Amino acid sequence: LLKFKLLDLSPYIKPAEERPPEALKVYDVNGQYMADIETPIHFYEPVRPDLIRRAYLSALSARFQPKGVYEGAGKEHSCESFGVGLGIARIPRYKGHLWPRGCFAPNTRGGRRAHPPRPEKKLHEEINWKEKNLAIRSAIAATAYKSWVAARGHMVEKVPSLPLVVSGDAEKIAKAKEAKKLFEVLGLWPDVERAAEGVKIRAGKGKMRGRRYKEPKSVLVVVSELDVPLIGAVRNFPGVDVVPVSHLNMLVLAPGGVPGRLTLWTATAVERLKGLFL
Amino acid sequence: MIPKPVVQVPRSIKSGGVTKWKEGRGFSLGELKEVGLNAEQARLLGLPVDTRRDSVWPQNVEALRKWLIEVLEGKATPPEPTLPKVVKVKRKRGRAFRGLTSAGRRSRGLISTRFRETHNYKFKKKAKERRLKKRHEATKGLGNVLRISRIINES
Amino acid sequence: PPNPTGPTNRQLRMLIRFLRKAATANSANIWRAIAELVERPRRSRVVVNVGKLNRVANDGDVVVIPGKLLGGGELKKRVVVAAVSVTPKAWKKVVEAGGEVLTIPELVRRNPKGSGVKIVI
Amino acid sequence: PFTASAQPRKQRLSLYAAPLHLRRKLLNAKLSPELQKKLGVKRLPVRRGDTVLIMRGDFKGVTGKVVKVDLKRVRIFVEGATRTNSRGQTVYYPIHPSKVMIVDVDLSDKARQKLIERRKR
Amino acid sequence: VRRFKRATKYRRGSRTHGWGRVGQHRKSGGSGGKGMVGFHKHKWSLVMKYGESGTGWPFYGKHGFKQPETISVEWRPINVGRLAELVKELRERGEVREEEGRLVVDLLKLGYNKLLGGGHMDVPLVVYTPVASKAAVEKIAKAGGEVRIVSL
Amino acid sequence: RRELPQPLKRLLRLRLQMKRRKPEFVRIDQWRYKRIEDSGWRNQRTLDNKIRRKWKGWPKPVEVGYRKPAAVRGLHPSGFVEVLVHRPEDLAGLDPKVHAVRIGRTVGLRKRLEIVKKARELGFYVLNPGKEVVELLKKE
RNA sequence: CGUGGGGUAGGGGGGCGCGGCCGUGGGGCAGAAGCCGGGCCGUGAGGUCCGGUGGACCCGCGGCCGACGAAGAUCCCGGCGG
RNA sequence: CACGGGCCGGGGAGUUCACGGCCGUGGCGAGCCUAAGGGGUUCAACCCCGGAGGCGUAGGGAAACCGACAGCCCGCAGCGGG
RNA sequence: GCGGGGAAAGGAAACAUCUUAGUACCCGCAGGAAGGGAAGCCAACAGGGACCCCCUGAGUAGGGGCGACCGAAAGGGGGAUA
Ligand SMILES: [Mg+2]
Ligand SMILES: [Mg+2]
Ligand SMILES: [Mg+2]
Ligand SMILES: [Mg+2]
Ligand SMILES: [Mg+2]
Ligand SMILES: [Mg+2]
Ligand SMILES: [Mg+2]
Ligand SMILES: [Mg+2]
Ligand SMILES: [Mg+2]
Ligand SMILES: [Mg+2]
Ligand SMILES: [Mg+2]
Ligand SMILES: [Mg+2]
Ligand SMILES: [Mg+2]
Ligand SMILES: [Mg+2]
Ligand SMILES: [Mg+2]
Ligand SMILES: [Mg+2]
Ligand SMILES: [Mg+2]
Ligand SMILES: [Mg+2]
Ligand SMILES: [Mg+2]
Ligand SMILES: [Mg+2]
Ligand SMILES: [Mg+2]
Ligand SMILES: [Mg+2]
Ligand SMILES: [Mg+2]
Ligand SMILES: [Mg+2]
């Protein structure tokens, strides 16, 4: 049924890293192995970085705001070209006491900008809904590989197993200290430490516009439903994103347009995932 | 859940006999008489009432009977009545100067034709479309460009 | 124009590489031809409906489609068909016609030389 | 009342153009642990007559009595953090209130006790 | 999806921007008028290339009249082979009632107003259609079904 | 300094000769005009361009005939492959026989000392220790 | 493998640089950007390093987006010459 | 002995929208896509709904009106035989 | 926002009908919105059911030196509902 999803190119092409297992390991709040669950069908999608990049670029481009200049900028002076015969160039000039001063042309000081940004410009890159959901399934499948997460740049040496799934009791934790303990026992605290130490003051003009700090991404937490206490428990960690499973999107699944994000799935979220994005 | 009336979309000659259903303006007087209310009682209960409609649809009658049974048995809360709850009438200044008297209405063409078909409406509508660069006004000569392109590409 | 670049899909790129290697190894020109037909630009890629298989195939035929197989029309023959991709309706029709749907690498592994395989575009 | 906007231009505009009753909030300084145990509060607005310990700068470690507070600059003159000009006159270094810790409280003002009780509540 | 560099990047440094040095980039005189103009004087060669010789019909002139769309019928026909596929899908989905020992199809319910004769019929089915072609009726009869002409 | 095989030695000597004979690529009148004195090469598409037409006695245009041998292209004049190092952890994964270390220009003196000591103890050829680092290590 | 190597207009292919954004990895008061001279690398756009000056920001790599590259317009503004 | 620039610094020119043709890729495929809009959200992002409508699936004719293929041959690739 | 008076430049590769455009502009008169609004309606023998605004119908019908070019309405989906 998924034979076209898993294209076996043996023998002339040597196989890559193994597909995610038929079951998923589950860990308790204490970080211990507890049980197994059947792997959802979303994890069998092949990783497609081009499709992931397209879907991510669409989701990011939907956020931009229209920019422009003043419509009359450089154009409201009383000016006029005085023709030839005065020994001077025939660009428009000031009419009044400032007469020979150039005016209105894009090459004149104070003149209009020739091709400024227009607020009617289309910044959003639309994507088909089926294509977007296919890219989301591909990114979810990419989270289950250790190679992709390491290539994205996460610290996954201490993680017991990917896809990383925790028990459903973790959703009741309502305190940042308890959530930090859970991250420490599950091996995600090194990646959160990487984000917290890798925050930096970015170079350029973004500091004046409110982009002074460029922070890395550490861990994406997936819960079953909205308003669980774990969201408020973990949302203050540096680089950590927490969403319910129905709110999964490319902006959290593939930051930078690259697949493979260190994801902590709850068991109830993994059960709920089987009827979404398909 | 307050039921919504279901009416037939009018079957045009262009359609060729394909008929569909739509949300009507309100329940008919015949449908309301089938359940034992008039327009005033229905509007007090909060139902939408269309005294103009002549049709009587059995699905509308059944939905009305069911919901009215829940309402009378207290398992449902009716909405506020479908009657005017506010009366805001502004003082009119310069009606003759703004052409709102009978002579002004006649000269603006509202006595004879619809507001959408009056000439001032056409002027304002085309002005708004050209200002916003809306559907057809984003390109001038769109029809002629299409005609020539169709001739060239379908020869 | 922007010249043909080849597919951006790494699955298609690996499948083309697989077909070229199989053709070189087995001295089967069919795999080379199939790879050349699969490498084609996206605006002129091969798509075949199941109804065309009714004409261009009889019972017991092994057919390779260098592109997508779409489910259109009715199928009344029993055929083994391999394709780059198969729509759900096409796979359903091929199955209830008694036939089989294979991947192109599966067909290559089953028949390394591609003897008797018919190219259908 | 100080902007809640996240934009640095709005933040700096609010801080610079805050009226005096808002600029009083910028004189808040941490109390010593002993003063915290005594009063039940963690911060108090620095007032003339308070004794503070300078925690940063060239005069770090110097404790003195606050001789002057300027709300406009949001600055305080601390006894001991001084120097001599070219003519020999002694001048005070303007210290930001956030760089000192209050070790003595001037509680002779009735309004100050009300503020203390409000913060201890 | 693939992305390409804009032409202006290549054209920076070239003086004329691809418009040539003799015939430079000028105003609408370089296009021979503004808009779709000149087709009877200096683009008549274009008219003779694409349209009818002599009259130049599709560019210029009238031909015939239009029957009013508000009084004409908008037809949505369906061929017999496509109908067979549709009835197969409906019977699989349980949408078909075998009312008289045969399948029953309503074209108006399905969204069609005319039955054509393209394709093959393989099952006995009764069709309710306001219009059916001769070959469509004959092929339905060969299948063993029947066409019933309803009145609009 | 770096030992190379014999074809690479011959190619390095040839690259030295080609660098000696390579012309400087300038636009017309770059010597004359101060507003274009420091500009890089510009292949100006003009009517009466004589550099492009390769007239004898004029400057020469940029061509791929002047390309140096590919096997030794981009090598340091000592023969080593230069690697930009911005901290002592950058030294991991480098081979001292093949690679030379070039410290980043904005690396501070404190980190430069550690980079130089680690690289020299590992046997790397450090190209640009710096005058201050050289004085400190001489003093040590 | 080629009795391949000139080329304006023009068509096609690749790359360098500038401002910002999404990621990723770093440098900086033991001295960032900028400026002056110099060595090395690259056919080249350009890169990189050294010495001086300077005093807080900046950069490598992958992706994306532009108010993105000047020698000239009796060009505009300013400064300054014979 | 054709016109422009005294010099230097900085500025200085193929933009965006609509529509159409085409190309390179990606999704789905006898079907493809939703628009306005609605619900939720960590709130212009994002998730879900919304198939109205548009294009394709059948053409011919001014219109009334009518309404469509696997039969044969040549033959590239490919396959099989010598 | 409402009522009234009301161009030309340009386009049509000349130009007058035309367009530009009931625009620029002018005169008068209101509100926080204005105007519209409750069938002497639309449809076609099947039925909708005041009005405004949004998406569509649609550059379709139609107007027009039938040239340039101009250009609905009914119907459907929504906001809202008296
Ligand atoms: Mg300006
Ligand atoms: Mg874009
Ligand atoms: Mg800078
Ligand atoms: Mg128009
Ligand atoms: Mg030309
Ligand atoms: Mg000429
Ligand atoms: Mg010119
Ligand atoms: Mg003529
Ligand atoms: Mg006639
Ligand atoms: Mg010449
Ligand atoms: Mg420096
Ligand atoms: Mg050549
Ligand atoms: Mg970059
Ligand atoms: Mg020039
Ligand atoms: Mg001057
Ligand atoms: Mg002078
Ligand atoms: Mg001249
Ligand atoms: Mg001159
Ligand atoms: Mg104009
Ligand atoms: Mg004219
Ligand atoms: Mg004229
Ligand atoms: Mg109002
Ligand atoms: Mg009113
Ligand atoms: Mg008009």
UniProtKB/Swiss-Prot annotation, chain D:
HAMAP family membership: Ribosomal_uL24_A
Superkingdom in the source lineage: Archaea
Record-level Gene Ontology MF annotations: rRNA binding; structural constituent of ribosome
GO biological process: translation
Membership in a protein family: Belongs to the universal ribosomal protein uL24 family.
Entry annotated with the keyword Ribonucleoprotein: yes
Keywords: Ribonucleoprotein, Ribosomal protein, RNA-binding, rRNA-binding
Assembly, per entry: Part of the 50S ribosomal subunit.
Disulfide links within the chain: none
Keyword Ribosomal protein carried by entry: yes
InterPro entries in the record: KOW, Rib_uL2_dom2, Ribosomal_uL24_CS, Ribosomal_uL24_euk/arc, Ribosomal_uL24_KOW, Translation_prot_SH3-like_sf
Its job: One of two assembly initiator proteins, it binds directly to the 5'-end of the 23S rRNA, where it nucleates assembly of the 50S subunit.
Database matches in SUPFAM superfamilies: Translation proteins SH3-like domain
Full protein name: Large ribosomal subunit protein uL24
Annotated Gene Ontology cellular component terms: large ribosomal subunit
Curated annotation (Swiss-Prot), chain E:
One GO MF term attached to the UniProt entry: rRNA binding
Protein name: Large ribosomal subunit protein uL15
SUPFAM superfamilies xref list: Ribosomal proteins L15p and L18e (SSF52080)
Function: Binds to the 23S rRNA.
Alphabetized InterPro entries for the sequence: Rbsml_uL15_N (IPR027386), Ribosomal_uL15 (IPR030878), Ribosomal_uL15/eL18 (IPR021131), Ribosomal_uL15/eL18_sf (IPR036227), Ribosomal_uL15_CS (IPR001196)
Recorded family membership: Belongs to the universal ribosomal protein uL15 family.
Lineage of the species this protein comes from: Archaea, Thermoproteota, Thermoprotei, Thermoproteales, Thermoproteaceae
Coiled-coil intervals: none
PANTHER family found in the cross-reference section: 60S RIBOSOMAL PROTEIN L27A, LARGE RIBOSOMAL SUBUNIT PROTEIN UL15
A cellular component annotation (GO) from this entry: cytosolic large ribosomal subunit
Extent of Basic residues compositional bias: 1-15
GO BP, sorted A to Z: translation
Pfam families: Ribosomal_L27A
PROSITE patterns per UniProt: RIBOSOMAL_L15
Summary of subunit composition and partner proteins: Part of the 50S ribosomal subunit.
Region (Disordered): 1-34
Highest taxon of the lineage: Archaea
Gene3D superfamilies: 3.100.10.10, 4.10.990.10
